[PDB]
């Protein structure tokens, strides 16, 4: 009833097949994230990765920021999130320029210069879009509260 | 929909999730599943 085998039946690779690293749920979940999902073009997986992080980065400066005790509470959070997504996409494109210069194959469409460039473009679009949509929900928070409770219905 | 009871924000977040996220996620996963291979 052993639950920790070696990774993929290979006992000399440096990995164990633990219930977290190599379970069925982990295979179906980690293997279906945009970074690992099958058949996607790099632009759509970069777009889906980007929105999940733009929507995330709005919060930390919105609730904990130099502007959190003023009337421009959400604008400061949005400005910080755009700064972070800008430097994130600059880092992503610099990584693409650096890593993928020697010619490699096309076994994975993401680990190539065109693929990583598409991933960086999608990450930028998704990140700034997610940041602005979280800003738009937060700025119009009275509206969202009223429509979820039924103050206008 | 005011909530007099304890944790009135909890239905505020759980009616969208059980109404949309649970159906959209469950039908999305089942649509990938019943049509796989």
């Amino acid at each position: 009833n052993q639950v920790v085998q070696a990774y993929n039946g290979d006992p000399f690779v440096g990995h164990l097949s633990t219930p977290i690293s190599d379970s069925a749920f982990t295979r179906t979940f980690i293997g279906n994230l945009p970074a690992y999902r099958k058949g996607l073009s790099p632009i759509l997986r970069g777009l889906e990765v980007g929105m999940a992080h733009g929507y995330f980065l709005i919060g930390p400066w919105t609730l904990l920021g130099p502007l959190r005790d003023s009337e421009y509470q959400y604008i400061g959070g949005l400005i910080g999130a755009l700064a972070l997504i800008l430097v994130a996409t600059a880092a992503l494109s610099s990584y693409g320029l650096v890593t993928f210069q020697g010619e490699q194959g096309s076994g994975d469409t993401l680990q190539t210069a065109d693929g990583w460039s598409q991933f960086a473009a999608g990450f930028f679009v998704g990140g700034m879009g997610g940041a602005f949509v979280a800003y738009f929900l937060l700025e119009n928070l009275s509206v969202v509260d009223g429509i979820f409770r039924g103050l206008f219905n | 929909m005011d909530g007099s009871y304890a944790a009135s924000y909890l239905p505020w977040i759980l009616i969208p999730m059980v109404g949309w996220l649970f159906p959209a996620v469950t039908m999305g996963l089942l649509f990938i599943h019943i049509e796989s291979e």
Partner: peptide
């Protein structure tokens, strides 16, 4: 009445039948 944190305590307790129901249903699927 009832407390605010008793409801969240009930939710995090019921997270355990969620995990065990998921694993039982997965094991029935075999």
């Amino acid at each position: 009445a009832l407390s605010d944190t008793q409801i969240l305590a009930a939710l995090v307790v019921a997270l355990l039948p969620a995990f065990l129901a998921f694993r039982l249903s997965t094991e029935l699927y075999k």
